[PDB]
Amino acid sequence: PESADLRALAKHLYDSYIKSFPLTKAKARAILTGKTTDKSPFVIYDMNSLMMGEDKIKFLQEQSKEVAIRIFQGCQFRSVEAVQEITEYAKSIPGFVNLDLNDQVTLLKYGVHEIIYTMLASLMNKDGVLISEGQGFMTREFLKSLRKPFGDFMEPKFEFAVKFNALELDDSDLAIFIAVIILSGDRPGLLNVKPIEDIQDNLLQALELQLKLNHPESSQLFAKLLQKMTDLRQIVTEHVQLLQVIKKTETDMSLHPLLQEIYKD
């Protein structure tokens, strides 16, 4: 009756999830653990291996920029792609496209980055991150070696990733979890909160049922994810703070317009 509908919803969200996001967590873990028969990644652990694998595992390449800014700029454009993938997914959530268009923008403005970090964990282990649709692996250590402005820019996403990955969620749990984040009825500037809260409540129930059936032995996996949602806010907060340090302490800082609009806050 109501639960059968909560399972149908969970499966719709998963089917749309697999459409919007090519590199699933299942595939990413298959590569990180070494379980794929379809090739293997190129490791970038120092400045020399970056050069050899620069044109490799890549997303007019003559930038003449410092390695730190080129990496950072590489991050910008995977985020640009991800913002588009998240938007395609958010529009597949039943009832989203019927929201006030300006409320949709607000939900995406304050939600994309929370979801990018969540899904970024699926590509991360304690040693690095899968990059370029699984073609490359960038060591966490190599990212800290960067200059002091950009050296503590990815470590935060690593700390959260290792902890979030301890929960052992799959693509089904993440599909609903992402939908709940997007449908937050407490995003600043929303004009019609109640219709957003009604959707999230129905999503939270599908998530709770999803977790009980999928992780029947992991008691309190729901209350743990509700806390992670709160963490993701402070994590993005500290992230936006760092960006303004760069924008203020760094020159020659080209930023993609889509991120300028999202970051305007």
Binding site: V83, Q84, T87, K91, L101, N102, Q104, V105, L108, K109, P257, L258, E261, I262
Partner: peptide, 11 residues
């Protein structure tokens, strides 16, 4: 001027 809005309106 909203890029996010143009993304939201595309099919």
């Amino acid at each position: 001027p909203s890029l996010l809005k143009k993304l939201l309106l595309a099919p």
